[PDB]
Design a protein around this ligand. Structure first.
Ligand SMILES: C=C1CC[C@H](O)C/C1=C/C=C1\CCC[C@]2(C)[C@@H]([C@H](C)CCCC(C)(C)O)CC[C@@H]12
Ligand SMILES: C=C1CC[C@H](O)C/C1=C/C=C1\CCC[C@]2(C)[C@@H]([C@H](C)CCCC(C)(C)O)CC[C@@H]12
Lengths: 45, 45, 45, 45, 45
């Protein structure tokens, strides 16, 4: 058999998954940042 | 020995692990977002 | 020389590191969740 | 080179995506560390 | 043979970045765990 076609599909799937991770990570950084700023302006601190 | 069969298996394992990482990241962003909001409504702040 | 063997080795090392990442992230979510619950019970909030 | 060219392009895209993830994680750690300090140094605690 | 030299190079760069990510995550969970303990002991809570 020729496994090249399947290997290419696996690599493409890896990039698809990586794009999802990157998207999630950038949103996560935004949430943590909001949380940080909120704690900084917390009068009780 | 042709190594394509083994390489394909490695690629498949990579994607399976990525699937898990993506799922964990999704659940994590949810917890953080919940924490963010919980703090924005903290009495002593 | 044939680089196929070395390519397979790189893929195997990648999966090892990715496995460690999966485990670390799994523990991290638990820590964040515990953190979330602790804040939800913070009397000052 | 049959599918070789396409496979190399996928690998290049993966490395680029990884670089971004790495940069995002670097920023996230500083935010979390800045938060860890802000708390460790909160009066009411 | 094949674009093997080029593909191997991309795989080596990917591993280098992944090892860095692993180390970043390791340090990050440490900081989060520290944050968790600090809150658990926050008398204001
Ligand atoms: C970035 C992220 C998002 C990802 C991780 O879960 C870690 C994290 C935590 C935010 C937290 C954790 C516990 C302590 C914090 C910093 C709260 C303070 C303890 C509130 C001080 C309250 C007081 C005023 C009465 O003494 C506000 C937000 C809380
Ligand atoms: C920053 C953080 C730390 C905080 C969150 O957990 C999210 C995160 C993830 C890092 C990851 C997740 C899955 C995908 C990545 C980006 C790996 C790649 C899939 C490896 C491509 C491998 C290959 C070689 C076969 O083509 C390397 C590091 C991995």
């Amino acid at each position: 058999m020729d496994l090249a076609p399947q290997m290419l599909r696996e690599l493409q799937e890896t990039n698809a998954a990586l794009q999802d991770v990157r998207e999630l990570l950038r949103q996560q950084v935004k949430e943590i940042t909001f949380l940080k700023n909120t704690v900084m302006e917390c009068d009780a601190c």
